[PDB]
Design a protein around this ligand. Sequence first.
Ligand SMILES: NC(=O)[C@H]1CCCN(C(=O)[C@H]2CSc3ccccc32)C1
Ligand SMILES: [Zn+2]
Length: 139
Amino acid sequence: SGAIYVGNYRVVNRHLATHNDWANLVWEDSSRDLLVSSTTAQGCDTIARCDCQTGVYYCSSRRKHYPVSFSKPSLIFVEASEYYPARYQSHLMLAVGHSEPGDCGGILRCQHGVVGIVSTGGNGLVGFADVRDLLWLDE
Ligand SMILES: NC(=O)[C@H]1CCCN(C(=O)[C@H]2CSc3ccccc32)C1
Ligand SMILES: [Zn+2]
């Protein structure tokens, strides 16, 4: 679990969105596993606007932050699950690091701010849904 709170927006994994997230929907994209909903209170986070490929993510299944080298956002095949049929997930960045399904929502951060959130993983990998291209989050 986990979310990004920026301005009057809450960014979560679309597969983990609540009834409240859907009732206050701003934008969603099943192909990115992303959902953005509106909040009344101002958010704590700021978004990186960069091309960093190194960062630090929070892994709740270890209660630890880990440094990672991650790929550029891309279309990656994701095997079927309870949440989605087998498909290509876009704007996904892969890295070697520990992750378990409950780790989705953990923030990936670089020196510039929030890069994205944990969305995929398994077998020593961790996939992050990029948010750096979502410029409208800052306005
Ligand atoms: N974005 C999706 O389609 C995901 C929906 C939940 C299941 N997905 C996974 O990759 C799991 C497998 S082991 C793991 C480890 C960290 C995170 C997720 C996962 C796919
Ligand atoms: Zn950066």
